[PDB]
Amino acid sequence: LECHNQQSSQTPTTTGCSGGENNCYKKEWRDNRGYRTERGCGCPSVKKGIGINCCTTDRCNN
């Protein structure tokens, strides 16, 4: 799986993960008027006000 690694950008880049993670998350956090979001590999089961999602496809976190 080769999802996006860059965050807070319009034209991010793709990169294949290793080890054993076939899921790429995409957490989004707001401040007030605007908000950003970061991607990566791994679906954590934490708890926070910030949004957290997970997918299993190429460039799923774009």
Curated annotation (Swiss-Prot):
It is found in: Secreted. GO terms for cellular component: extracellular region. Its main location: secreted. It comes from the Eukaryota. This is Cobrotoxin II. It comes from Naja kaouthia. CDD domains: TFP_snake_toxin. Expressed by the venom gland. Binds to muscle nicotinic acetylcholine receptor (nAChR) and inhibit acetylcholine from binding to the receptor, thereby impairing neuromuscular transmission. Pfam families: Toxin_cobra-type. The keyword Secreted applies. Disulfide bonds join 3-24, 17-41, 43-54, 55-60. GO terms for molecular function: acetylcholine receptor inhibitor activity; ion channel regulator activity; toxin activity. Residues 1-23 are annotated as: Disordered. Residues 1-16 have a biased composition (Polar residues). Keywords: Acetylcholine receptor inhibiting toxin, Disulfide bond, Ion channel impairing toxin, Neurotoxin, Postsynaptic neurotoxin, Secreted, Toxin. Coiled coil: none annotated. Belongs to the three-finger toxin family. Short-chain subfamily. Type I alpha-neurotoxin sub-subfamily. Gene3D superfamilies: CD59.
